[PDB]
Design a binder for this molecule. Structure first.
Ligand SMILES: C[C@@H]1NC(=O)N[C@@H]1CCCCCC(=O)O
Ligand SMILES: C[C@@H]1NC(=O)N[C@@H]1CCCCCC(=O)O
Ligand SMILES: [Ca+2]
Ligand SMILES: [Ca+2]
Lengths: 591, 591
């Protein structure tokens, strides 16, 4: 406690040793006469290491002091090779400091001496950490590329600077240029480094991946660099023809799509916590890509799978609305007069008349729950909500159905507690399917969301009071009136089921508490959709997020669906003779 | 699945055959030496049809390759006449491709050869479909007019380009210019094509109608082209005099008004789904036209017809508030104790004392319903809500009155279900009559809408519980308290009629559900009118729509009203000697 306090002390301790060491002070003050009155008479320790393990030349390189540095190099040419022996700057040479300060005469003189163009500055200051204001890499060639000094860049290549060099994070000089603030100027420097590549199709510098398996083009999309992305897109697009205003350009569509497997631009954009990366799926090679995946295949399968989940949940309630008998049997109704339980457990089953109709319905609710677990549980092993918490709810729903199964086969009294949780988890997970005029567009999402919530809480409130006596607190004595009570409940017109002389079950005081919060948030999410659609162009901000939600869902539907359905995007390039990648044909009009 | 996938494959398949065919490749690459080393030794198939049924000249015309095209024309002058034999480009000649690319030297050379200036490019790419980025027509003259190349336009007329030419959609060159994005530049090209007209008053190019019966001037209004509309308005306005800043201009007002019959700019603007066309009724010849139609004749007749409909509905409730007797008679009141019915049916009528007063009232409710059907049902045969859903409700209201008549004459128990629907349909259709300070202006619409809704639901809730016992659930035991209960109901102050030990009729659980939604939307439409009037100039957006609603209603009132009322707009031009059209006198001041 802490680390920044140390370097703040060391930077003060550095200026303290510079103040003290006259050789280091004269190197800072550029006192030429004081350096000759020190190096020639009387011979002072010229290999003097300062507070940061720096030589007198390092100090002479920090402060642009060419006259003082040239004196230190002619009286002791060995100081050029000495790196910073400190921990904060372990590996930095006098060439690194001269390159960043863009001191061309000092760089030309250090290269004339013979300075190492491959020295890795592995100091803790040079790390890619949020507490370091700059991240340029380790090699001096990487420093020149980031300061925008094209003169030093080629001057280092002339002395044998390996552009293929990677730092401790496996980043080439191309990766580091994309992580820079000046995006519009780094595009110019990016093309300068590519010219010095081997010129061969194999072992390309643009193909050398990051240590996290990211080519520079791929890293531009994950980091949300629009300027570098559009620039890198030029190298991978081909214009077929120009018919007046139309321009039928053909995009490469290789590193932008599965598979893979985890390697694909789309999966990396929807799963990253970087908001800025959202904008990448709106670029002119990518926005055409997800819009076609959602028009065909995407939207129909989401509604086909949607209607299946609607039937699978209405069947679960069909077995809940007609749950198992019987009357109380027990005389316990006389003691503890606050109780209202006409408790109903089994079995006492089969017995079959109309009970096999619900047994096959209960069997569907079980085989569907494990199928839900058979497609989700093997997926958590390989987690970002963008995207909706549909997956978090779909696994806890099948968890409650299995618990209700284990609740059964034991004749437990608390049947109702796990079974009522699956009612809201089953329906409210339906409203996620609303992904399938903006005031009217967001209003229809409320009408969907609202009708979905009441069909999950009225079914719940029915079960909560299907056992309990309806003469007192009879808001839900049958299904058509449990729906109507809950509907009125949703708008606070009814005072809500309230009774204090009677002991209502533990689940009402819990389920109604959650119904009171969701009913207000949906009524609060409605006002923001009524005003936030008209008050400003924020409706665009209220819009892409949904669009990104649709894109996140479209990538989701492509992972588990087999290959016979959902054909690959684009057109393959084997016979016709483009190999072997799949290309997207895009034509655009200009005005 | 799909069609765009095919052309994406064919464009890739085209570049595949170009890659393969050396004659087609050299035509694309503009390889002059390779074309002579192919056409002279050894004689290759020069009539080579590519993937899109294109000749080597077509490829030489796609990519501006004049040197390569001139070689193909001197070695085989027959390639000029060959059109694209494919399905996507059926009819396109090498002249079409040269005109769009604005290759004047190639167009001058193709016309020197003798190219057809009347070749219709009937290919599927050239269709007016949303999946085609451009729509220029079929004839090469129409292509030049859309690219803005006035040099090619007159160069085609010099070689006999028929400006009277129509494509498959019956569109002249004037119609296609209005459907173009560059509106401010198409005005210049529009005047160039009109100069080459026959110069005769009859058979004018501006009068040649679309296949959908639309002159170019009329099409500009339907499509919402403001720049072309104001430009076309210059040709049909006459300035009478200039008295300083005043300019008394006289507008033609011919194709802007009925009749007709369906042919009129106003009816085409209010019935189209094109939002952009709304702006046309705000132009300086049209905005003066509907404002005079609404000031006189318009506003009074809407309130005269308004007060008539107010009396016709209050009479319907006057017969409902005093509906037919009698007591229950039946002992069924002891079994099914949940029931509260003191059911009342007839007849048991006449009997007449004060019952003839309601019989003539019931007779008015019948003759008025058929009259409503006599003015609406013959109108559906000849449907856009702009405009209000007043017509959809006014026909279903008279439907419920006729059903209640058929409900009667059979002594059916369910009298109440069709009769209660006509109460809300009758009143809530009144609030449409609110069409007759912006915060205060939209607030008075709420006070109208609110008082109209409660007078339709309190009358309904009264009927719902006029039969049922008032000792339990007695919110509506008489009319003055049914109104006061419902009024309090409208603001959720009262917990709403709630009872669970008693079986309330089927209509309360339905009518009160609709009362709970409309009462919140009117309270939500109020907040948007309180904030959306001040937060931005969106109040203009909240305003024209109402203005367009008033204009849509004004056109509605002019269709069924006879000719003796509502005189024609403007002044006729027969004696005085302007013939025979009706003109509007408009004077404007400038600063
Ligand atoms: C100024 C210090 N004195 C010195 O000789 N090297 C240091 C250079 C500081 C660079 C800090 C870059 C970073 O924040 O990581
Ligand atoms: C490029 C294609 N090659 C060719 O010879 N004709 C085509 C011209 C394309 C025009 C497409 C206009 C449209 O979208 O309809
Ligand atoms: Ca309240
Ligand atoms: Ca209350």
């Amino acid at each position: 406690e802490s680390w920044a306090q140390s370097r703040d002390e060391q930077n003060l301790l550095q200026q303290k040793r510079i103040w003290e060491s006259p050789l280091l002070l004269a190197a800072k003050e550029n006192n030429v006469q004081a350096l000759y009155k020190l190096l020639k008479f009387e011979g002072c320790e010229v290999h003097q290491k300062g507070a940061m393990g720096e030589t007198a030349l390092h100090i002479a390189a920090l402060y642009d002091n060419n006259e003082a540095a040239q004196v230190l190099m002619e009286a002791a040419p060995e100081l050029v090779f000495e790196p910073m022996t400190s921990e904060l700057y372990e590996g930095q040479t006098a060439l690194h400091i001269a390159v960043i300060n863009q001191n061309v005469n000092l760089v030309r003189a250090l290269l004339a001496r013979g300075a190492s163009v491959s020295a890795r500055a592995t100091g803790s200051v040079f790390h890619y950490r949020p507490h370091n204001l700059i991240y340029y890499g380790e090699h001096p060639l990487s420093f020149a590329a980031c300061v925008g000094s094209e003169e030093i860049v080629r001057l280092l290549i002339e002395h044998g600077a390996d552009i293929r060099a990677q730092d401790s994070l496996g980043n080439t000089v191309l990766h580091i240029l994309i992580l820079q603030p000046n995006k519009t100027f780094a595009c110019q420097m990016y093309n300068l480094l590519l010219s010095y590549d081997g010129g061969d199709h194999l072992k390309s510098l643009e193909l050398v991946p990051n240590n996290q398996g990211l080519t520079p083009f791929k890293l531009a999309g994950v980091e949300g660099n629009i300027v570098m992305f559009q620039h890198l897109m030029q190298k991978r697009k081909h214009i077929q023809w120009t018919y007046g205003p139309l321009t039928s350009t053909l995009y490469d569509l290789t590193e932008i799509d599965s598979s893979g497997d985890d390697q694909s631009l789309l999966e990396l954009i929807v799963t990253t916590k970087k908001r800025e990366a959202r904008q990448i799926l709106d670029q002119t090679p990518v926005k055409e890509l997800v819009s076609l995946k959602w028009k065909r295949y995407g939207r129909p399968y989401f509604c086909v799978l949607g209607a299946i989940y609607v039937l699978y949940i209405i069947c679960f309630t069909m077995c809940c609305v007609y749950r198992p008998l019987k009357p109380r049997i027990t005389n316990r109704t006389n003691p503890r007069d606050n109780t209202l339980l006409q408790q109903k457990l089994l079995q006492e089953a089969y017995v079959t008349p109309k009970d096999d109709l619900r047994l096959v319905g209960e069997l569907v609710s079980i085989v569907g729950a494990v199928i839900i677990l058979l497609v989700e549980i093997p997926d958590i092993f390989r987690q970002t909500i963008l995207g909706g918490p549909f997956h978090v709810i779909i696994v806890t729903y099948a968890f409650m159905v299995l618990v209700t199964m284990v609740m059964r086969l034991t004749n437990s009294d608390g049947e109702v507690v796990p079974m009522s949780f699956a009612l809201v988890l089953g329906w409210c997970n339906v409203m996620y399917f609303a992904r399938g005029k903006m005031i009217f567009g967001d209003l229809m999402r409320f009408c969907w969301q609202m009708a979905v919530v009441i069909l999950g809480f009225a079914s719940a409130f029915y079960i909560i009071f299907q056992t309990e006596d309806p003469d007192e607190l009879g808001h839900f004595y049958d299904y058509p009136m449990a729906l109507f009570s809950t509907f009125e409940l949703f708008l606070t017109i009814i005072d809500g089921p309230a009774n204090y002389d009677v002991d209502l079950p533990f689940m009402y005081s819990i389920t109604y508490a959650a119904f009171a919060i969701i009913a207000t948030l949906l009524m609060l999410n409605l006002l923001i959709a009524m005003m936030g659609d008209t008050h400003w162009r924020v409706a665009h901000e209220r819009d892409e997020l949904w669009r990104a939600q649709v894109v996140a869902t479209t990538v989701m539907l492509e992972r588990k669906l087999p290959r016979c359905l959902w054909p690959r995007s684009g057109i393959c390039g084997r016979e016709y003779g483009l190999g072997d990648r799949w290309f997207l044909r895009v034509e655009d009009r200009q005005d």
